[PDB]
Amino acid sequence: APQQINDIVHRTITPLIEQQKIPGMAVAVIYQGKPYYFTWGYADIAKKQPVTQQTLFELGSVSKTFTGVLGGDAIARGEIKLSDPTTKYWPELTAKQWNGITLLHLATYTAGGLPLQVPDEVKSSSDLLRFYQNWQPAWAPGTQRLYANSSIGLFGALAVKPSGLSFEQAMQTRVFQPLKLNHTWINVPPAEEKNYAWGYREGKAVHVSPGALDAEAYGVKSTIEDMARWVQSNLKPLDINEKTLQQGIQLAQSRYWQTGDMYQGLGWEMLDWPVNPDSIINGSDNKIALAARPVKAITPPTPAVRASWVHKTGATGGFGSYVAFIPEKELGIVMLANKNYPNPARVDAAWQILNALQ
Numbered sequence: 496a497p498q499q500i501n502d503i504v505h506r507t508i509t510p511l512i513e514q515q516k517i518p519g520m521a522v523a524v525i526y527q528g529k530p531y532y533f534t535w536g537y538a539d540i541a542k543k544q545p546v547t548q549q550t551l552f553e554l555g556s557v558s559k560t561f562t563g564v565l566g567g568d569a570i571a572r573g574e575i576k577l578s579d580p581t582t583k584y585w586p587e588l589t590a591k592q593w594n595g596i597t598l599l600h601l602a603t604y605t606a607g608g609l610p611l612q613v614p615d616e617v618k619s620s621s622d623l624l625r626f627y628q629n630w631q632p633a634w635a636p637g638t639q640r641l642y643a644n645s646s647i648g649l650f651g652a653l654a655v656k657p658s659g660l661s662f663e664q665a666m667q668t669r670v671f672q673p674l675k676l677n678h679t680w681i682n683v684p685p686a687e688e689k690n691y692a693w694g695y696r697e698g699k700a701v702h703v704s705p706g707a708l709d710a711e712a713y714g715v716k717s718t719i720e721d722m723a724r725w726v727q728s729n730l731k732p733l734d735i736n737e738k739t740l741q742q743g744i745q746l747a748q749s750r751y752w753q754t755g756d757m758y759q760g761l762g763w764e765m766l767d768w769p770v771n772p773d774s775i776i777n778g779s780d781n782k783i784a785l786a787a788r789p790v791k792a793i794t795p796p797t798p799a800v801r802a803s804w805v806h807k808t809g810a811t812g813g814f815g816s817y818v819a820f821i822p823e824k825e826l827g828i829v830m831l832a833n834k835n836y837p838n839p840a841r842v843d844a845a846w847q848i849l850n851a852l853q
């Protein structure tokens with residue numbers, strides 16, 4: 496890799512691993528549409544397995560970007576419309592609070608207060624129905640944004656309903672396969688377990704636990720190589736031959752709502768570039784990213800803006816991931832660590848690296 500890129504990455508990630516005590520990490524910088532890899536530490540401390548470009552990391556909420564794109568693909572295919580009411584795909588959902596709550600609302604966390612987490616007690620299919628039937632909106636739809644798994648997660652499940660495929664099957668056939676993301680999984684097979692890093696929480700090795708809507712909200716695991724590929728596809732959707740997928744990617748980068756200087760897409764969150772570091776850096780901290788905020792509707796949504804900082808943070812008990820790209824500069828970065836460390840530290844490092852490359 497150009498010594499230029501090598502220097503900036505090393506000078507930035509080395510002190511980060513040191514200060515955040517990250518056991519293992521993999522970084523991918525996409526520069527001029529070409530990827531460059533870097534890896535540090537351990538995937539498995541106990542078994543002394545090093546992190547490699549084949550190591551699988553939990554993407555956590557970065558999985559939401561795949562869901563947003565898969566939903567975008569369904570829209571492109573004419574299977575669903577973001578303007579359709581939620582009940583069109585789940586008629587069993589008869590509670591009157593759902594009146595006026597659309598797929599757009601579920602996809603963008605603006606349904607009216609759906610919670611961040613689906614309760615642990617909610618498992619069966621009838622349990623989820625009851626959960627949603629009983630839920631009480633604190634606000635009218637399309638007024639307030641509250642980041643939530645139960646919101647975009649439901650969107651993912653309903654979105655693949657017409658395809659007749661299971662969420663996982665739809666995701667593989669419609670997104671992973673076409674993009675050649677061959678080491679990206681919702682459920683990692685026995686054969687790949689050897690490459691699955693252990694997450695570390697308070698020094699204990701852990702992996703994400705099963706949950707309702709987990710696949711749709713935070714259950715994807717991937718390698719630094721496949722995530723580099725995921726970035727390139729999102730930086731250049733026109734390079735994709737599958738019409739509906741290409742279109743799906745564009746739809747996920749459209750700006751539907753605005754809060755502060757952030758714009759909500761389907762899974763991805765965007766900001767006008769050049770962006771102010773302190774603004775995306777502090778804007779990422781969970782003190783802001785997860786709070787209740789009023790949103791302004793973008794009527795109609797602004798189609799994907801090439802000059803934007805497109806990104807998403809992701810976390811699980813044991814993992815911390817981050818993805819950010821600038822379509823206009825054919826520039827991007829993927830950071831995958833097996834420790835959940837502060838978001839601001841991720842964004843800060845990401846910005847130092849990309850800003851230094853234009």
Ligand SMILES: *[B]([O])([O])C1=[C][C]=C(C([O])=O)[C]=[C]1
Pocket residue numbers: 554555556557611612644712713808809810811
């Ligand atoms: B995501 O990585 O931000 C995310 C947020 C919350 C949860 C949860 O509480 O289970 C999973 C993933």
